[PDB]
């Protein structure tokens, strides 16, 4: 279907000694494929998926050089931001940056993004036009004037509509055996008595990819949200995801309840009822 490539960057200042901790990760859809960790020994961008390992030395050298440059940019930024906000040198602070591009089913550019946060709050973001900036406060407004003067949006737009989508397409091709394969949820329902006349039904979806999924309960064919619990979608640890939704029912009435599962890997939604 549609696809995306995203990079996530986190820098955390360490006032007591040394430079900020810096961690960068890259994803294609819900698959991590590269990482850089300033605490790690290599000091290089590293592969995290088989299909990227085939990239040659020029790739790895280039990615390493660029991500290291990002790290230094964030280091300076932390200093600049501390001044903007008139903060002490004593406290730890965080800069986060995320950018990437989405393509449609035809692998053509759909949208691009680039946003930046200080201490967990919006700071500045490129608008969807890839020309304008959303600055959240007056410090960010100062940054926005700086970035206007430096043609920053022009460069990001060129990257997001060009290099970003071009290499995404390359990756989707090289990793097609997994990146373009959907893994439908393996589903089942469990039953747990809560008393001698009430029970929890739990509808499980396991080992699915991508992470996007919808689990809903119906009673007698109408959606029910009362007395339900839906956990956040969570990584299995093997590249797939898990989720469950549960409902408390009067014992003996289990057959009224149906769990409905929607996922890209399922031509038609699944319906589960208790055994």
């Amino acid at each position: 279907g549609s696809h995306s490539m995203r990079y996530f960057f986190t820098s955390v200042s360490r006032p007591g000694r040394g430079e900020p901790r810096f961690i960068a990760v890259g994803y294609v859809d819900d698959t991590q494929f590269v990482r850089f960790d300033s605490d790690a020994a290599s000091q290089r961008m590293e592969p995290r998926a088989p299909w990227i390992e085939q990239e040659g030395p020029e790739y790895w050298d280039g990615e390493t050089r660029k991500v290291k440059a990002h790290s230094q940019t964030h280091r300076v930024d932390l200093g600049t931001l501390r001044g903007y906000y008139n903060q002490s040198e004593a406290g730890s602070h965080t800069v986060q940056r995320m950018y990437g591009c989405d393509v449609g089913s035809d692998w053509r550019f759909l949208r691009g993004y680039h946003q930046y946060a200080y201490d967990g709050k919006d700071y500045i973001a490129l608008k969807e036009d890839l020309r304008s900036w959303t600055a959240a406060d007056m410090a960010a407004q100062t940054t926005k004037h700086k970035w206007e003067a430096a043609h920053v949006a022009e460069q990001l737009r060129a990257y997001l509509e060009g290099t970003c989508v071009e290499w995404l397409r390359r990756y989707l091709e090289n990793g097609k055996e997994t990146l373009q394969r959907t893994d439908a949820p393996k589903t089942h329902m469990t039953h747990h008595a809560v008393s001698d006349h009430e029970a929890t039904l739990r509808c499980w979806a396991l080992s699915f990819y991508p992470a996007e999924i919808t689990l809903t309960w119906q009673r007698d064919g109408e959606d029910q949200t009362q007395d339900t619990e839906l956990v956040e979608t969570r990584p299995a640890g093997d590249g797939t995801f898990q989720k469950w939704a549960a409902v408390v029912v009067p014992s003996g009435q289990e057959q009224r309840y149906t769990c409905h599962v929607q996922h890209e890997g399922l031509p038609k939604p699944l319906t589960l009822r208790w055994e």
């Binding site: 960068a24 280039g62 990002h70 700086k146």
Partner: peptide, 9 residues
């Protein structure tokens, strides 16, 4: 492929 870094804030 990552982008080149932007100007500082």
């Amino acid at each position: 492929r990552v982008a080149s870094p932007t100007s500082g804030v």
